[PDB]
Amino acid sequence: GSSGSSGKTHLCDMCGKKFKSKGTLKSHKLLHTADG
Ligand SMILES: [Zn+2]
DSSP: OOOOOOOSSOBOTTTOOBOSSHHHHHHHHHHHSSOO
């Protein structure tokens, strides 16, 4: 996970996926928190 650039577009530094809305990025983020 590399810290990206402060961009409105909800960007995921965990994998590198960009989203327009939050709810979308959220559900996608939860997936990352699997092992932990
Ligand atoms: Zn991600």
